[PDB]
Amino acid sequence: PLLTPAEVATMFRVDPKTVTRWAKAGKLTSIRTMGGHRRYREAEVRALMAG
């Protein structure tokens, strides 16, 4: 399963650009759409509620 940047934005209650920024700095593995959009592996996103 994959999640959109908006969804990941909602779960932490943070702006989706900040999700984009957690993708920047390495602590979120991001798969990219061939238009260059982010899709985040939802397992890692569990690891972030584990943290």
Partner DNA sequence: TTCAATTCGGGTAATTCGGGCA
Partner DNA sequence: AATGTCCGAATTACCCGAATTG
Neighbours of 45 (CB within 10 A): 21
Least distance between a copy of itself and beta carbon 33 (Å): 6
Distance (Å) of CA 31 to CA 1, 5, 11: 12, 11, 19
Least distance between DNA and beta carbon 43 (Å): 18
User: What would the x/- binding string for a copy of itself be over residues 1 to 20, using CB under 8 A?
Assistant: xxxx-------xxx---x--
CA distance linking residue 5 with residue 38, whole number of Å: 6
Among 33, 43, 49, 50, binds DNA (CB under 7 A): 33
